């Protein structure tokens, strides 16, 4: 847990607010597998604004 469990086990922030571990992306967002790690089971879906 880069930043503690809320949503989910593995969903959390990461990339410093910039990314959230998401099981699917939205569209205003993009998945970042950097953070794809630190996520675990999940995928970094950061904001395509981050």
Do not use: K, L
């Given at each position: 847990?880069?930043?503690?469990?809320?949503?989910?086990?593995?969903?959390?922030?990461?990339?410093?607010?910039?990314?959230?571990?998401?099981?699917?992306?939205f569209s205003h967002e993009?998945?970042?597998?950097?953070?794809?790690?630190?996520?675990?089971?999940?995928?970094?879906?950061?904001?395509g604004?981050?």
């Amino acid at each position: 847990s880069y930043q503690r469990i809320r949503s989910d086990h593995d969903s959390h922030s990461c990339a410093n607010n910039r990314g959230w571990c998401r099981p699917t992306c939205f569209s205003h967002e993009y998945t970042d597998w950097f953070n794809n790690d630190v996520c675990g089971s999940y995928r970094c879906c950061r904001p395509g604004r981050r």
